[PDB]
Design a protein that fits this description.
Chain I: This is Proteasome subunit alpha type-5. This is part of a larger assembly, with 9 protein chains of 9 kinds. Chain B has one domain. Chain B contains 5 helices and 12 strands. Classes of the chains: A alpha+beta (213), B alpha+beta (216), C alpha+beta (199), D alpha+beta (235), E alpha+beta (198), F alpha+beta (201), G alpha+beta (204), H alpha+beta (240), I alpha+beta (234). Chains D and H meet through helix 3, strand 7 and helix 4 of D and helix 1 and helix 2 of H.
């Protein structure tokens, strides 16, 4: 018959630093065993302080993003101001529920800085449940990214060691290498890397090379 | 969904310097039968963009009547605007997406090429709604066959002329005819350029059968 | 079930058989599958006999209106798109497949296959469950610029060939020659079916 | 007499008084002016306060990144129609993923105002609109009427005492094309002066502007950025 | 499966019900009240699907209270059962079917006591005694032996306990506590809640 | 998922785990399952997480519209009945939500339960979730309405810690909330494993 | 199927100047019996009765809707209904449900109000009216109730021979039906009077 | 009197004055003319300049209903754009039905039927606009039809709508338009436009011309500025 | 009469909207004040007989924790809007999970003001214009704010606003007492001065209701105890 969904792969990471928030995802878009293209940026910039990742079925990733951008203008025209990172997260929760009977198939990750200047990472599910955490992951390699950030970022399971708050210099190199290690063992990750760092001064994009296999 | 019949074949497209070539076979297919050997699978949209598709051709003629009238209605308006190759690629993305929620999806795979204001556009949509932009695109088994052929050229030579492009298409049209049982000999090579869309008539390709003597 | 139409200089020849069988038993061995939609506009019924007869009346209802509003015979392209849109839109509940052919003062004789919901122009068109086995004769024996006498025999030989191989086809051959001066209706009795290789 | 009771009934001269009363409703609002160059477009809006303690009302409504509009007429009739304009523009980026052409938006505005006219019981929308926007063909100044008529314009002034501005717009029309962003503000604020009384003239409190341009998206200015714009302009 | 039982005496109606409300493998509420009061002398016993039991019975509860307030007097026992059957029969062919088993207990100043049996298909039949659930098979047979129209409530309550003690022997589900009430000329009278200090 | 609540002389105590998992992978360990409705009124979560977050806020919406209307500080009984009726209209469409409502009113510290099919119950001790049966054992053992404030914390603490040990879907840190007449208050947040080391010794 | 849920049997035989109708008293759910007092025959007015069988949900529901149309018909018209008129009324009530049809097999028996003439008829699930000159029966055991009335029926029978014939047909045929039994109510419709009797039957 | 209040109420003489008053509103509109010949049909419209503040190309009075079907409307511009899209919906639904371009006689009938439908109901109002419909084809040929506010279509070798009509219709009768070619007809169209307009009330205007026929290959097309200026110079040879 | 609710004037204004504002002069007087320390609201109970209970009269309603409201004009139309304004306020927190700006509170309510008509409407359509005037005070991220709406739906930010029958002389009196940084407690004093002048009755502790919102304290209604301490300061 007709299959309404298909797994398009990909991986999305978000980490909340002290004064900063970093969000990165790959460019690889592939369905089944074939590659559609090697450049397909999933990272979308909502506002200056907020960047949303999308990992899942690509058809729902495009439409749901256009629906969010439409409601961004509804807010700003009404409220004369931009949405906070926490306001965008709670909004899409009700957006994902409106489909509760025929849910959108996607994994959304929202990150950025709040009014206090602290990073806020928001991980979602197709039914719309959400939470705030220091760092989250998503996509096909989501199982791979989480343990590495628990030890390195979270300082977990380490006895008698100095705990230093997250630094931007290390946070960049940690996000780069976890994807370098991801592109090794993940068939759905590689070919390029795009890193979007949201700070108090503004957003700064980066490009990192990865293996083409 | 139910049963469409009226099956199509693969479609190829690529980018070169100052233009886009899109070629497809003229054969309609019913089940395992090759029935209609003369069909125009490449449709022109205004001057600067062009469309071709696969899958159900009966649904494609319906997309002719819908998109065609909508494009003509703009030419009837005469406001001085023309649908951009991204606009046609965007409208087909939502139009095909709107058919999934009503549980009546149309079987088709469409490719939108075009050249406007020095910007060469080639894009891909699908019944499943997957949409993106790539310098070389193909449908059906072409993505398995003709796609890696063009990727190797674009990596070595990102810039291709109009003659080099048509020569690579014929070489890709030659390979697709070999390994695709549902393909067909007669095809049309259509090229959009600064002069607009120009669709060449029925064409063929010289085949090398020497494998017959090398096997035996 | 076999329907056939062949275009020539002065018009078209649209043939059909008389056999209508629901299942393995013949309901009626003599039936006319050509239902006039207009003077020169005819429709060859095929597929489901119940759905084809319903569309033929729904098509005639729309064509008579379009014909009386213009006070002139509608074009063959007009009658073909009526059957197609009724086919394509209602294909959910309608499995019928029709072949539209006729003559107009513009381009003359025309034959438009409406089968499966699409539309295309052909010099000769064949349809039905028995048209699949006659592809060999209609392709090779077709020659350009055949006289009306040769077109009647070319259409008869292929239909009589389908009637032999198709189990659902039989009866008598109905021929309709649609030209500018009128339409001639002929019936070929079982003795007049052209004899082919019998072994 | 008895022909002004509704829209549908025609006068013996073939006129609809209710449409006339809707066109006179727009002239009872604030006076706003706008103009475009070969590059930029500037919309100068006059803000009024209901009382001395009350803050000035907002006459500028943000529509699209390249599009802006000033409302003159019944306030709530503009708001329901603004929800229609914004919805159509959101639908443009929801479907076409491109900024809606300003000429196609205004054509949808008229179609919305053509619906109430031909039907009995439904009142026409009594708000007028001065809308501007930038596209591939450059900036455009459009005006709409409650009669559903809409025109393409180089520059216009709507509201009370607008002819003293329009006369100013006629004399400097030759300069409006070649001036740059800083001069368009100078001509726009001096054009607003003619619609204003002889006592209260120019204050950054009740005067606000907006600007769209080639690479410049539509941006609303209120006080801080308007203060240097008023400086250096002699009235 | 919840259990219901009722008995029609000459001047009285004796009804009883299980107080256990369970979910999955555990009993969440063992004191749960299955008895709903339709009118002064008219009670109701509703069991069935956990969702349809409370929801559909509360509809009947107020619909009976609708009649009593509009005309100033409550439905009769016969009038109440026949209106509840139409309510259950109307939703039978709807998209929300109700699975419930109801016993209507009431007393009339003329016809006297009345007990009514109702299934999930809304089939109303008057009977001197009736029961629901799987426990109805282990109980009603005892009533066949000991029932007489002249029985006194003093012996009926004793025979009711003999039937309900069979639910603790053969019948598998525990059901520790049962609620028992009686209807007569003097109104609703509560009886000692059956308790088994196990 | 393990959630439990019980009422006694000093009021209700709500205890819950922090862990919610999808399949074999743990989605988040730090999830806060307890829903905050009113200052003195406290909800919970069970089953689907999105169904709870959606409907419990509608209950919090109804409770606030009530207090803004009549100012009567809606009772726990009225809140539990309104939550059950909203689940009845959509019954059969696939909505799965468990929950428990806790709070004090003129009658007392009421404890109610609302199921996915509309089951509304009342009693002294409730629990829900995948580990509810593991909670019933420890809670029932050594429980009386006369338990003090400090003794009841030890019962609620050992309830989650020993129940989440036997469940693969239950874990995280123990979040226990006592209920009072003025309102509920956060008592302690402690990891299950950190308390496991104290119980083994 | 669904008609076998409550079982049941209805019998109507035509005599000479009179007609007799009979049905059993049993009501049960599958293997679980309920009550002995169930009534399968409801009065349609003077000298006209109707039998009902099958699922008892529709038995009591259609009986309402037939009394719905009966009383409205009797209040509008100044004369009583003819048994031939009622047959077509049940046909319309069952046919309007053609998508959702009720489950029952109504049996109508009575006397022509003209002078003495007896009239009988029965319908089906599809609501097809049928007129027979001998007898009509319906139920799950209807195959058993045929053979009794086939041989025993005579062209003309007095009330003495009619009651004896229909009673023996009920007692013998119902005893072979598992879902039927527990007493038989027999109604005798004569020109002068109407007789109702309850037969002594086995409890089984 | 109350008889002319609603269109559903007849006058004492058996007329509908509401339809008549909608026709009087058309008489205030600007003048637009058209002429058909063997080569095709030539369109022209007088577009009045309301102010210098309006951009070139504003208030376009040349309407395109369908690829082979042009239209020029004189009347209320609100009801003009309404029927404009409605006429396009009828031509689009035709091609969605019969799969080709609707003939001009068949299109003028369906549109005029939609116009007369609002004259019957008292809950709506009739159209206050009148327009002409040209078309060209190889099987039919040049055809010109005009629909009034009452919804009745008449075949015309030439027609004039707006304020000045009878004066322009007599000038067309003074010379045979059939044997002419669209190149020579546009010379007469611009000649009539200059005769109709003088400076008394109106100030300035602009020439909006359109061609359909062999020159345009049977498709509705606007006249370019180069040919328009050259067509004016042919009319600038005389004026007198 | 001989016209619809949608019929325009020869000057182009709706009769039903004009008469709606003219009906507010029959309502109750309420005076709001916006200050840097909060927003003050005061209203008179208007007791025409001792048999009535002052507890049943609430002319100051609470939309949100930090957002208050005032009431005048027709009572029947206000109770419909007070409930609708509350629902949309919670629909905001149900969606965006934040407190609605008082400007958006005035925005959502102003939408339903002019929706009224006859043809081409639903059964939930209003026939007649609102005869109620409203005052929305409150504190938000931008500080204390006080807004006003009329039957036409126009909402305007105001430093001080008065409604009711006495709004004619009270609004002119607010310009006199309001200067620069004047605090909440000082505004409460000036509120009772103007309110006592405009009322026909005597100012009493239980005669008027007084409620204020602060940046550090939620909207609070002063009870009979505190009201006696406030009136004492006169």
């Amino acid at each position: 018959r007709f299959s309404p969904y298909a797994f398009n792969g990909g991986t999305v990471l978000a980490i909340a630093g002290e004064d900063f928030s970093i969000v990165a995802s790959d460019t690889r878009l592939s369905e089944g065993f074939s590659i559609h293209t090697r450049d397909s940026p999933k990272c979308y910039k909502l506002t200056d302080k907020t960047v949303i990742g999308c990992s899942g079925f690509h058809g729902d990733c495009l439409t749901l993003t256009k629906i969010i951008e439409a409601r961004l203008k509804m807010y700003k025209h009404s409220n004369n101001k931009a949405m906070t990172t926490g306001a965008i997260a709670a909004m899409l929760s009700t957006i994902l529920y409106s489909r509760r009977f025929f849910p959108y198939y996607v994994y959304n990750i929202i990150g950025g800085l709040d009014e206090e200047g602290k990073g806020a990472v928001y991980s979602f599910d197709p039914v719309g449940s959400y939470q705030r955490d220091s760092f989250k992951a998503g996509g096909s390699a989501s199982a791979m990214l989480q343990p590495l950030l628990d030890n390195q970022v979270g300082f977990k399971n380490m006895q008698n060691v100095e705990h230093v708050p997250l630094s931007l210099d290390r946070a960049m190199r940690l996000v780069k290498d976890v994807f370098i290690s991801a592109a090794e063992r993940d068939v759905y990750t590689g070919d390029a890397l795009k890193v979007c760092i949201v700070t108090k001064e503004g957003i700064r994009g980066e490009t990192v090379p990865l293996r083409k296999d | 969904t139910q049963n469409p019949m009226v099956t199509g074949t693969s479609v190829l497209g690529l980018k070169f310097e100052g233009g886009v070539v899109i070629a497809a076979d003229m054969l309609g297919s019913y089940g395992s039968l090759a029935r209609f050997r003369n069909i125009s699978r490449i449709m022109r949209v205004n001057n600067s963009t062009m469309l071709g598709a696969s899958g159900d051709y009966a649904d494609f003629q319906y997309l002719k009547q819908v998109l065609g009238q909508m494009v003509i209605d703009e030419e009837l308006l005469g406001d001085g605007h023309s649908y951009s190759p991204k606009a046609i690629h965007s409208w087909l993305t939502r139009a095909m997406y709107s058919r999934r929620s009503k549980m009546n999806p149309l079987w088709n795979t469409m490719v939108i090429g075009g050249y406007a204001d020095g910007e060469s556009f080639l894009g891909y949509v699908d019944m499943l709604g997957v949409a993106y932009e790539a310098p070389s695109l193909a449908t059906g088994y072409g993505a398995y066959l003709a796609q890696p052929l063009l990727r190797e050229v674009l990596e070595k030579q990102p810039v291709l002329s109009q003659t080099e492009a048509r020569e690579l298409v014929e070489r890709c049209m030659r390979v697709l005819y070999y390994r695709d049982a549902r393909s067909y000999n007669r095809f049309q090579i259509a090229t959009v350029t600064e002069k607009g869309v120009e669709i060449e008539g029925p064409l063929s390709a010289e085949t090398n059968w020497d494998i017959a003597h090398m096997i035996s | 079930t076999t329907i056939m139409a062949v275009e020539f200089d002065g018009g078209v020849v649209v043939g059909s058989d008389s056999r209508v069988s629901a299942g393995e038993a013949v309901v009626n061995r003599v039936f006319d599958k050509l239902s006039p939609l207009h003077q020169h506009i005819y429709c060859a019924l095929s597929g489901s006999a119940a759905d084809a007869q319903a569309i033929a009346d729904m098509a005639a209802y729309q064509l008579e209106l379009h014909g009386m509003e213009l006070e002139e015979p509608p074009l063959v392209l007009a009658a073909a798109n009526v059957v197609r849109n009724i086919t394509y839109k209602y294909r959910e509940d309608l499995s019928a497949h029709l072949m539209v052919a006729g003559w107009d003062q513009r381009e003359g004789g025309q034959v438009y296959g409406t089968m499966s919901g699409m539309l295309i122009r052909q010099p000769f068109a064949i349809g039905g469950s028995g048209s699949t086995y006659i592809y060999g004769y209609v392709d090779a024996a077709y020659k350009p610029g055949m006289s009306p006498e040769e077109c009647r025999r070319f259409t008869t030989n292929a239909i009589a060939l389908a009637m032999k191989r198709d189990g659902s086809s039989g009866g008598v051959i109905y021929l309709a020659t649609i030209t500018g001066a009128g339409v001639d209706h002929r019936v070929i009795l079982g003795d007049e079916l052209p004899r082919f290789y019998d072994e | 007499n008895q022909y002004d009771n509704d829209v549908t009934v025609w006068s013996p001269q073939g006129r609809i008084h209710q449409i006339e009363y809707a066109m006179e409703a727009v002239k009872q609002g604030s006076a706003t002016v706008g103009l475009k160059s070969k590059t930029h477009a500037v919309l100068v809006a006059l803000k009024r306060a209901q009382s001395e303690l009350a803050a000035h009302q907002k006459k500028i409504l943000h529509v699209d990144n390249h599009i802006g509009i000033s409302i003159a007429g019944l306030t709530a009739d503009a708001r329901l129609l603004c929800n229609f304009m914004r919805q159509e523009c959101l639908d443009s980026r929801f479907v076409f993923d491109r900024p809606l052409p300003v000429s196609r938006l205004v054509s949808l505005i008229g179609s919305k105002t053509q619906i109430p006219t031909q039907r009995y019981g439904r009142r026409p929308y009594g708000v007028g609109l001065l809308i501007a926007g930038y596209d591939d063909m450059g900036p455009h100044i459009f005006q709409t009427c409650p009669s559903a008529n809409y025109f393409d314009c180089r520059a216009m002034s709507i509201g009370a005492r607008s002819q003293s501005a329009r006369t100013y717009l006629e004399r400097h029309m030759s300069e409006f094309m070649e001036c740059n962003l800083n001069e368009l503000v100078k001509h726009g604020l001096r054009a607003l002066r003619e619609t204003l009384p002889a006592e209260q003239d120019l204050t950054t409190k009740n005067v606000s502007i907006g600007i769209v341009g080639k690479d410049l998206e539509f941006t609303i200015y209120d006080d801080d950025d308007v203060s240097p714009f008023l400086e250096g302009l002699e009235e | 499966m919840e259990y219901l039982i009722g008995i029609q005496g000459p001047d009285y109606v004796l009804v009883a019900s299980d107080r256990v409300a369970a979910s999955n493998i555990v009993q969440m509420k063992d004191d749960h009240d299955k008895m709903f009061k339709m009118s002064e002398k008219i009670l109701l016993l509703c069991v069935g699907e956990a969702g349809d039991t409370v929801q559909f019975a509360e509809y009947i509860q107020k619909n009976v209270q609708l009649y009593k307030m509009r005309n100033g007097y409550e439905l009769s026992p016969t009038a109440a059962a026949n209106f509840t059957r139409r309510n259950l029969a109307d939703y039978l062919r709807s998209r929300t079917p109700y699975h419930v088993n109801l016993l209507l207990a009431g007393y009339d100043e003329h016809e006297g006591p009345a007990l009514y049996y109702m299934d999930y298909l809304a089939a109303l039949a008057k009977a001197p005694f009736a029961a629901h659930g799987y426990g109805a098979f282990l109980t009603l047979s005892i009533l066949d032996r000991y029932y007489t129209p002249t029985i006194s409530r003093e012996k009926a309550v004793e025979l009711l306990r003999k039937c309900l003690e069979e639910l603790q022997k053969r019948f598998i589900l525990n059901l520790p506590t049962f609620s028992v009430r009686i209807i007569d000329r003097n109104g609703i009278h509560d009886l000692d809640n059956i308790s088994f200090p196990k | 998922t393990t959630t439990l609540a019980f009422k006694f002389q000093h009021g209700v105590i709500v205890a819950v785990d922090s862990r919610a998992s999808a399949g074999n992978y743990i989605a988040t360990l730090k999830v806060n399952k307890v829903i905050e409705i009113n200052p003195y009124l406290l909800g919970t979560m069970s089953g689907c997480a999105a169904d709870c977050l959606y409907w419990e806020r509608l209950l919090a919406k109804e409770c606030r519209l009530y207090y803004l209307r009549n100012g009567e500080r809606i009772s726990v009984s009225a809140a539990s009945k309104l939550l059950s009726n909203m689940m009845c209209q959509y019954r059969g469409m696939g909505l799965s939500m468990g929950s428990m409502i806790c709070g004090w009113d003129k009658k007392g510290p009421g404890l109610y339960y609302v199921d996915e099919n509309g089951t509304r119950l009342s009693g002294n001790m409730f629990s829900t979730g995948s580990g509810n049966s593991h909670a019933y054992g420890v809670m029932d053992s050594g429980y009386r309405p006369d338990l003090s404030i400090e003794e009841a914390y030890d019962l609620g603490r050992r309830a989650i810690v020993h129940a989440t040990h036997r469940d693969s879907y239950s874990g995280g840190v123990v979040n226990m909330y006592h209920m009072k007449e003025d309102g509920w208050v956060k008592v302690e947040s402690t990891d299950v494993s950190d308390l496991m080391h104290q119980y083994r010794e | 199927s669904i008609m076998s849920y409550n079982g049941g049997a209805v019998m109507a035989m035509k005599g000479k100047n009179c007609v007799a109708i009979a049905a059993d008293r049993r009501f049960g759910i599958q293997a679980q019996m309920v009550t002995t007092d169930f009534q399968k025959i409801f009065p349609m007015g003077d000298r006209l009765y109707i039998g009902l069988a099958g699922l008892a949900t529709d038995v009591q529901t259609v009986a309402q809707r037939l009394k719905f149309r009966l009383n409205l018909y009797e209040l509008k018209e100044g004369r009583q209904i003819k048994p031939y008129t009622l047959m077509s009324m049940v046909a319309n009530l069952l046919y309007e449900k053609r998508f959702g049809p009720y489950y029952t097999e109504p049996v109508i028996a009575g006397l022509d109000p003209k002078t003495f003439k007896p009239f009988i008829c029965s319908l089906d699930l599809i609501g097809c009216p049928m007129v027979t000159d001998d007898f009509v029966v319906s139920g799950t055991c209807t195959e058993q109730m045929y053979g009794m009335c086939e041989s025993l029926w005579e062209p003309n029978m007095d009330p003495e021979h009619l009651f004896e014939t229909i009673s023996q047909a009920m007692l013998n045929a119902v005893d072979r039906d598992a879902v039927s039994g527990m007493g038989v109510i027999v109604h005798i419709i004569e020109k002068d009077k109407i007789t109702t009797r309850t037969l002594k039957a086995r409890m089984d | 009197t109350g008889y002319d209040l609603s269109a559903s109420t007849f006058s004492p003489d058996g007329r509908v004055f509401q339809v008549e008053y909608a026709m009087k509103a058309v008489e205030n509109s600007s003048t637009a003319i058209g002429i058909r010949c063997k080569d095709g049909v030539v369109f022209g419209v007088e577009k009045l300049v309301l102010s210098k503040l309006y951009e070139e190309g504003s208030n376009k009075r040349l309407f395109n209903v369908d690829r082979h079907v042009g239209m020029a409307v004189a009347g209320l511009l609100a009801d003009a754009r309404s029927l404009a899209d409605i006429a396009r919906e009828e031509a689009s639904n035709f091609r969605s039905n019969f799969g080709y371009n609707i003939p001009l006689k068949h299109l003028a009938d369906r549109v005029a039927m939609y116009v007369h439908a609002y004259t019957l109901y008292s809950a709506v109002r009739p159209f206050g606009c009148s327009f002409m419909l040209g078309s060209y084809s190889v099987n039919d040929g040049a055809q010109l039809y005009m629909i009034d506010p009452s919804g009745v279509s008449y075949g015309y070798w030439g027609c004039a709508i707006g304020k000045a009509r009878q004066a322009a219709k007599t000038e067309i009768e003074k010379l045979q338009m059939k044997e002419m070619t669209c190149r020579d007809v546009v010379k007469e169209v611009a000649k009539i436009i200059y005769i109709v307009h003088d400076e008394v009330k109106d100030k300035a205007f602009e020439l909006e011309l359109s061609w359909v026929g062999e020159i345009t290959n049977g498709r509705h097309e606007i006249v370019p500025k180069d040919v328009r200026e050259e067509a004016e110079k042919y009319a600038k040879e005389s004026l007198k | 009469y001989d016209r619809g609710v949608n019929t325009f004037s020869p000057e182009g204004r709706l009769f039903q909207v004009e008469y709606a504002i003219e009906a507010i002069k029959l309502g109750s007087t309420a005076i709001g004040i916006q200050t840097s320390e909060g927003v003050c609201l005061a209203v008179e109970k208007r007791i025409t007989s001792p048999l009535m209970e002052p507890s049943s009269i609430e002319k100051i309603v609470e939309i949100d924790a930090h957002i208050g409201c005032a009431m005048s004009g027709l009572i029947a139309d206000a109770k419909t809007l007070i409930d609708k304004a509350r629902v949309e306020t919670q629909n905001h927190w149900f969606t965006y999970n934040e407190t609605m700006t008082v400007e958006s509170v005035t925005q959502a309510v102003s939408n339903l003001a002019l929706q009224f008509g006859e043809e081409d409407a639903d059964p939930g359509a209003m026939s007649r214009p609102f005869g109620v005037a409203l005052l929305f005070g409150g504190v938000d991220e931008k500080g204390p704010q006080l807004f006003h709406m009329d039957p036409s739906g126009t909402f305007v930010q105001c430093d001080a606003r008065a409604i009711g029958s006495a709004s004619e002389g009270a609004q002119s009196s607010l310009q006199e007492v309001y200067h620069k940084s004047m605090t909440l407690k000082e505004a409460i004093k000036s509120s009772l001065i103007i309110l006592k002048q405009v009322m026909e009755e005597k100012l009493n502790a239980t005669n008027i209701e007084l409620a204020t919102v602060q940046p550090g304290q939620n909207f609070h209604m002063f009870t009979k105890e505190e009201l006696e301490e406030v009136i004492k300061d006169i």
